[PDB]
Amino acid sequence: AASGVATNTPTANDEEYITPVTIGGTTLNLNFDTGSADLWVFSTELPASQQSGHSVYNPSATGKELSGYTWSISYGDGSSASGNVFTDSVTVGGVTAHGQAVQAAQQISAQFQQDTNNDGLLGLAFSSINTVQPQSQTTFFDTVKSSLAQPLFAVALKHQQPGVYDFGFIDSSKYTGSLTYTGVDNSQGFWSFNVDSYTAGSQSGDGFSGIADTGTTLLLLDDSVVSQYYSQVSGAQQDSNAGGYVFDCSTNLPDFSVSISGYTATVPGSLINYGPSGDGSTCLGGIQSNSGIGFSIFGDIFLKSQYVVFDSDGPQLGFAPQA
Amino acid sequence: XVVX
Ligand SMILES: *[C@H]1O[C@H](CO)[C@@H](O)[C@H](O)[C@@H]1O
Ligand SMILES: *[C@@H]1OC[C@H](O)[C@@H](O)[C@@H]1O
């Protein structure tokens, strides 16, 4: 049976987490994203000027082209990418997927062109939302799941320290106590779950649903919840230069918790201080608006507090406080 | 930050 551990590393301020992945012999630094299902990489088919500052895949060297197949994706922050497709060998933490679909980028939006921290994305959402046409392809996880000791992956994202992606096994030394599991609704291809209630410092409210997303930097909630939270932060104000609510870096922030199938997941106020707003001398809050989409995005700010198991059996998500 |  196979299992493996891939180490992730946060970029400045934990904006994103990157992990090495070997494709046809070349290692690339990718952003593992539980919110999408495409494995796409910077390639030699992009303009030379866009290949600069990146490790790129050269499909002609080892890939098998899928003639006439294309991909096109648009993300929540407005970024997008598109290209063609090849199959190749993909290795993550010693687990190798043979004939894994690799989406070679032919076009990338400015957000990707400016980000030299990653060389593409490895999607870990359900394969049902893979964008390849005419026939969608499976994610790296779906491709190898039948070969793992257990059909699950687990993650520990940390604040300014290396973390891990465990494939096919659970490392009990990464959390305190026992895991609590909750059912996942994968109807929209996400690892979506329900929370029965929330507590924002001194205020508590009714439940809602959200997705566990390693590919989103913040914890994005409904505007009502954001308001409630910041009403308790002295001097918090919105700053469009920073991207949302900001406050004095020294401010004592209230904690945020959600009740999940009887387990209380708490994000300590210290983790809600994302870092320098980069707009003078305030800090950006880890909690921001979900722009009215109707569901919450449990991004990295939230994940930094837990060890989370993404189990394809159910499917379900297990949670426990990080050790 | 980003929002995948
Ligand atoms: C993950 O699990 C596999 C199957 O037990 C081991 O062979 C591997 O060394 C790692 O513990
Ligand atoms: C990344 O790979 C394997 C290990 O578990 C980890 O410590 C390392 O940094």
Side-chain angles (χ1 to χ4, degrees), chain A residues 98-109:
Chain A
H98 300 274
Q100 165 70 34
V102 176
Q103 300 169 222
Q106 275 179 316
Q107 326 250 185
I108 53 177
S109 64

Side-chain angles (χ1 to χ4, degrees), chain A residues 4-9 20 93 162-164 166 171 174:
Chain A
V5 180
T7 298
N8 59 66
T9 319
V164 288
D166 289 319
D171 177 356
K174 303 278 172 322

Side-chain angles (χ1 to χ4, degrees), chain A residues 23-47:
Chain A
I23 305 167
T26 305
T27 304
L28 271 76
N29 281 337
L30 305 187
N31 181 171
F32 285 20
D33 179 23
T34 65
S36 71
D38 291 50
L39 191 183
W40 72 262
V41 298
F42 268 69
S43 74
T44 60
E45 310 174 308
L46 284 166

Side-chain angles (χ1 to χ4, degrees), chain A residues 18-134:
Chain A
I18 64 120
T19 308
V21 175
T22 306
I23 305 167
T26 305
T27 304
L28 271 76
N29 281 337
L30 305 187
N31 181 171
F32 285 20
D33 179 23
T34 65
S36 71
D38 291 50
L39 191 183
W40 72 262
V41 298
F42 268 69
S43 74
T44 60
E45 310 174 308
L46 284 166
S49 70
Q50 289 178 193
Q51 295 180 35
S52 279
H54 289 273
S55 284
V56 303
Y57 171 59
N58 162 23
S60 62
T62 59
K64 286 289 299 144
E65 186 177 357
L66 293 190
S67 186
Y69 279 61
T70 66
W71 60 280
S72 193
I73 191 159
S74 108
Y75 301 100
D77 58 16
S79 63
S80 57
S82 63
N84 65 348
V85 191
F86 294 86
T87 60
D88 211 331
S89 77
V90 176
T91 301
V92 176
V95 174
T96 301
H98 300 274
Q100 165 70 34
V102 176
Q103 300 169 222
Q106 275 179 316
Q107 326 250 185
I108 53 177
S109 64
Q111 300 116 305
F112 293 118
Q113 313 168 31
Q114 301 159 21
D115 187 350
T116 59
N117 299 306
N118 76 61
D119 311 310
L121 267 70
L122 187 142
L124 295 162
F126 290 91
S127 295
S128 54
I129 63 162
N130 173 260
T131 76
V132 175
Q133 308 248 50

Side-chain angles (χ1 to χ4, degrees), chain A residues 73-322:
Chain A
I73 191 159
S74 108
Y75 301 100
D77 58 16
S79 63
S80 57
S82 63
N84 65 348
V85 191
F86 294 86
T87 60
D88 211 331
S89 77
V90 176
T91 301
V92 176
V95 174
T96 301
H98 300 274
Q100 165 70 34
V102 176
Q103 300 169 222
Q106 275 179 316
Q107 326 250 185
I108 53 177
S109 64
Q111 300 116 305
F112 293 118
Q113 313 168 31
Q114 301 159 21
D115 187 350
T116 59
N117 299 306
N118 76 61
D119 311 310
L121 267 70
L122 187 142
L124 295 162
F126 290 91
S127 295
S128 54
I129 63 162
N130 173 260
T131 76
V132 175
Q133 308 248 50
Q135 302 190 125
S136 69
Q137 309 286 307
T138 61
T139 63
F140 167 81
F141 176 66
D142 280 332
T143 300
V144 305
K145 85 175 174 225
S146 79
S147 77
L148 298 181
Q150 279 165 109
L152 58 84
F153 62 92
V155 63
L157 298 189
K158 304 181 171 298
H159 177 52
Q160 295 292 278
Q161 319 162 67
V164 288
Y165 277 100
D166 289 319
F167 274 93
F169 83 108
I170 293 162
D171 177 356
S172 290
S173 75
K174 303 278 172 322
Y175 56 92
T176 298
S178 310
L179 284 171
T180 297
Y181 288 84
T182 200
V184 163
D185 172 5
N186 61 357
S187 71
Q188 283 293 152
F190 301 120
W191 285 94
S192 177
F193 58 99
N194 299 147
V195 309
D196 282 315
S197 67
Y198 72 92
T199 303
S202 312
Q203 293 185 53
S204 291
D206 298 320
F208 50 83
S209 71
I211 71 163
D213 193 358
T214 59
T216 289
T217 313
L218 307 174
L219 172 51
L220 309 175
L221 303 170
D222 279 352
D223 289 334
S224 54
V225 183
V226 178
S227 283
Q228 200 160 246
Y229 185 80
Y230 294 106
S231 80
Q232 305 168 64
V233 177
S234 197
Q237 59 191 28
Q238 276 176 275
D239 173 351
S240 53
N241 299 316
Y245 282 87
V246 299
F247 46 78
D248 184 300
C249 297
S250 303
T251 305
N252 274 328
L253 296 178
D255 305 323
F256 178 82
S257 78
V258 289
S259 170
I260 302 164
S261 290
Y263 167 63
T264 298
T266 299
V267 180
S270 60
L271 280 191
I272 305 170
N273 184 335
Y274 171 74
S277 68
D279 200 77
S281 267
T282 51
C283 268
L284 180 71
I287 290 177
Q288 301 295 342
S289 168
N290 62 7
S291 320
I293 64 170
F295 60 93
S296 291
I297 304 182
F298 287 92
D300 300 340
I301 290 295
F302 174 81
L303 302 174
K304 274 181 260 185
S305 69
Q306 311 286 314
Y307 173 74
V308 177
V309 176
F310 291 79
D311 189 2
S312 69
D313 177 47
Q316 55 187 359
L317 276 167
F319 300 91
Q322 261 193 53

